[PDB]
Design a protein around this nucleic acid. Sequence first.
RNA 1: GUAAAGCGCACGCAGGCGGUUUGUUAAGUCAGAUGUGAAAUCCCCGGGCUCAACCUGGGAACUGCAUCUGAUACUGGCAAGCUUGAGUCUCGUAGAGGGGGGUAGAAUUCCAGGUGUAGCGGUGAAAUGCGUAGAGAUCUGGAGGAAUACCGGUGGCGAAGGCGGCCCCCUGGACGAAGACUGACGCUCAGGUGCGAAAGCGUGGGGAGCAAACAGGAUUAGAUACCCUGGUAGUCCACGCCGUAAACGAUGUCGACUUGGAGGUUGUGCCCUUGAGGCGUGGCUUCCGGAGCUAACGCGUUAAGUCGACCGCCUGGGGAGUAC
Lengths: 88, 129, 218
Amino acid sequence: SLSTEATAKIVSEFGRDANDTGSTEVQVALLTAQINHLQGHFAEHKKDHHSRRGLLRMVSQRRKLLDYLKRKDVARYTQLIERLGLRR
Amino acid sequence: SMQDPIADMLTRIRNGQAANKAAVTMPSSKLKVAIANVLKEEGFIEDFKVEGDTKPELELTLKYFQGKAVVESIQRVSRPGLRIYKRKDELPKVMAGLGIAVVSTSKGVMTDRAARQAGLGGEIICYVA
Amino acid sequence: MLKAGVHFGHQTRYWNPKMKPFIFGARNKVHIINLEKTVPMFNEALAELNKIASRKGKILFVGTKRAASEAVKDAALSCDQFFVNHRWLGGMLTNWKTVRQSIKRLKDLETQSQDGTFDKLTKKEALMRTRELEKLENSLGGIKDMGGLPDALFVIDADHEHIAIKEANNLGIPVFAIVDTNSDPDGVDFVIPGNDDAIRAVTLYLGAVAATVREGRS
RNA sequence: GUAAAGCGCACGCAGGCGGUUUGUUAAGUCAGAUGUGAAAUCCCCGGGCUCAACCUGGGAACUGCAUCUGAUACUGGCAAGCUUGAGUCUCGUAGAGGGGGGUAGAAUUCCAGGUGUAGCGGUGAAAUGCGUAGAGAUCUGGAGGAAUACCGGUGGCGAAGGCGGCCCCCUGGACGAAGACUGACGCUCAGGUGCGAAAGCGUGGGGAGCAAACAGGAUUAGAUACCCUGGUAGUCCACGCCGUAAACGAUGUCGACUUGGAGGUUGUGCCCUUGAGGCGUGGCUUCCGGAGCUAACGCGUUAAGUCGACCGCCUGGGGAGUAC
Ligand SMILES: [Mg+2]
Ligand SMILES: [Mg+2]
Ligand SMILES: [Mg+2]
Ligand SMILES: [Mg+2]
Ligand SMILES: [Mg+2]
Ligand SMILES: [Mg+2]
Ligand SMILES: [Mg+2]
Ligand SMILES: [Mg+2]
Ligand SMILES: [Mg+2]
């Protein structure tokens, strides 16, 4: 999936502090990584549907984490989108 | 996924009594207990205890009379996605009276017979005969 | 736990989840009957037998299994008790009215040899009846003198003599038997969790019951 | 499941449903009251025409709606959480999971040449066909396309369709476990979106073997077939379309319970592990079978048993999955 390094790296920039990987913000950010990094893999090949299946699962999922965050605290939500430049 | 914990409790007992299980454990919870009380005060179950400190497990000791179990019939009624609420003058009578119907009134979880006298109605729950 | 300590469990691992409540442990791929309830069950049942035995109650012992057959016939003959150690004919109980006629032959035929009323007739003819008696003694033999269903039934093993118990519990005839793991206690109304095998195991209780029977009738 | 009926399969908006604790609210729920619910019908009790129909006094009912006053268990709203659901991280594990690109050996066919000589090929026989312009057989060299013996399995992976040589590159999911983290972020899903065997369609390639069409030979009464001799599309590839199948477990998805037996595959823990190993314990998977279920066959902890949440579908046969 994603490199162990790039992982821990992002777990800090968005993680509530460190050692924690459950933080909503974290997950969302972590997903966006593969989501974006995969665009390249899919920009090429294309016919690799089975792999796409995984891609969408990440998107649809992130959509929930984000949507959820907005409900539990609009703040973190609005800010989170900014750093990852999402929501159109 | 678990969308109705009450149903699981009732099912656990019916399937338990069928297999002649000494008792039956499960994740306790206020309502579950309150309902169990009625079952105890009615002689359908021997006793019950909720262990655990941060994870309550309700131990429901099944009961059997002669060559059969006490609870011969127990099915949920006011299930989700279709709740049922009756009036004091509209309380159901299980097995012509020989049976009971757990009802959650504003006064608490009591048997139909009892609530019907307390001059109050409420949401049925199931029929234990 | 006297001589009882000389039989332990039985049946490797085929067992039967129904006998679980009567099992103790299982070493070397074999369950061991929990004596903790075995011997306690012993008296509880044995007492009932003598209870009705007192009224000369018709007792019918069952045990076709070769290894234990001979023993059963002997013990059950220690009094008005009866026995069956040769292929439990289908109906000798539930179909007594019909099976009885067979016993009659065993009688009327025995008298033939029993008395001088046999020497007559050619070899072939006589021979024909001699062979016939043999077989009859196997099955009816140990029941030829029981004009009527037994007051109670006692079979060694359940599974094996399953057919017997079925006809018994149908006539309301109290069924007493020794079941072990693989056996099914849902039939015998008086379970006796013991090794249904071992020559020592069979005779052990076989004589035990017999005794309580002779002493049963005052 | 087989009688009519599980969408071919997924993702998922709306919608429906929602683990657990405390507080709070009181909207649904419940209790009481006040209005109102025309009278007449209906029903109960009782009257009057000689009875009855009929007529009539009072009550019950009008199961509803509104408001007022409370009750707070349950559902809902709010606040604060909690960790067992779900998810993230770490480290491991197996795999024909997918896309791209290489590559190897066996074999078929074809081309060239040597040896060699009268048959080969085919069938039940035959015949068509191929042979003296030298086949077949055999040997040597070369060209090319397709598929990967053995391993191989009751096997494995995938949502389904489906996926087998070896290597690299890019990439998805699943599982176990010492745990660490988030804190109900979940389940289902009309419409919608995407994936869809084979055949088929378009453009451009490719084309060895097999083979609809087609052409011969045969069989037969006939033989627009089965068989034989050939052989085009196609089968192969790229990109676009088609969207169907007995798309089958003929069995929707999610979760919880309910005797047992024998086996497979994979993770992991313990055991002189000194051992092949034995014992546990998760995931997935065969067959047998108990209770129970079922019209029966059968299913049977991977249920068609016992339950809860959501969805899809059926309502006699033909006409017809046809017409418009
Ligand atoms: Mg059919
Ligand atoms: Mg059908
Ligand atoms: Mg299907
Ligand atoms: Mg009116
Ligand atoms: Mg609440
Ligand atoms: Mg095709
Ligand atoms: Mg084409
Ligand atoms: Mg699978
Ligand atoms: Mg089966």
